[PDB]
């Protein structure tokens, strides 16, 4: 749409400016423009895309949880009836959140996943697909809830099978997928045991593979193993 007249290299350049300015909504729109040029994204470009949307939907999720919490409070025994406003404003944020998740998923589906033949790009896009369905599951409430949770699990699982076949245990994408799938098990799929087992074996297999690594072109991997450990500490 709006980015159709801008050069692909000018979109990538502006997305990096928007990142430095913490302007994530502009960053997401530049990267959506760039995707819509129809060429594959490089490793660096993939990172720009995922960071931009993670941040946009991250602020929506934080706002949704403040509002949903207010809303649940107003439904407790002896809470004063405040009218329709809290539900209305919660639904507004929620529908804006859902439209951003639908936009990311439409980008994955047209045509990032289908054209992704290397493991690192394929796994990366399937992880994103799992995360965005997960964000949708967090707010899902009606009939769709089961199906959304399953689209998340199904995307994460396909990314896991490929990452296990094609990537070393310390690969940062392989590690971040396991971190996130493991959170899915805990917070969405009601499977705290599967969550804990996945983070543990993930952490342990990556430990045993550190010796093969240069010291350090693997700061992202170090950071993620730490988040696996922090999750394990919260959960056990």
């Amino acid at each position: 749409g709006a980015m159709g007249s801008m050069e692909r290299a000018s979109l990538i350049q502006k997305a990096k400016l928007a990142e430095q300015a913490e302007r994530y909504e502009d960053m997401a729109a530049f990267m959506k423009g760039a995707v819509e040029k129809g060429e594959e994204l490089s490793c660096e470009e993939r990172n720009l895309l995922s960071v931009a949307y993670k941040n946009v939907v991250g602020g929506q999720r934080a706002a949704w949880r403040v509002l949903s919490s207010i809303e649940q409070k107003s439904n407790e025994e002896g809470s004063e009836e405040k009218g329709p406003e809290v539900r209305e404003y919660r639904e507004k944020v929620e529908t804006e959140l859902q439209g951003v998740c639908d936009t990311v998923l439409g980008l994955l589906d047209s045509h990032l996943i289908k054209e992704a033949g290397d493991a690192e790009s394929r796994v990366f896009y399937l992880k994103m697909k799992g995360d965005y369905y997960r964000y949708l599951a967090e707010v899902a409430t009606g009939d769709d809830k089961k199906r959304i949770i399953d689209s998340a699990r199904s995307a994460y699982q396909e990314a896991m099978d490929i990452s296990k076949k094609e990537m070393p245990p310390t690969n940062p994408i392989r590690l971040g997928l396991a971190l996130n799938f493991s959170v899915f098990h805990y917070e969405i799929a009601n499977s705290p045991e599967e969550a804990i087992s996945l983070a543990k074996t993930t952490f342990d297999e990556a430990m045993a593979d550190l010796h093969t690594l240069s010291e350090d072109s693997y700061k992202d991997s170090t950071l993620i193993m730490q988040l696996l450990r922090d999750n394990l500490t919260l959960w056990t």
Partner: peptide, 5 residues
């Protein structure tokens, strides 16, 4: 809230 990446 647990960490994700």
């Amino acid at each position: 809230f647990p960490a994700t990446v």
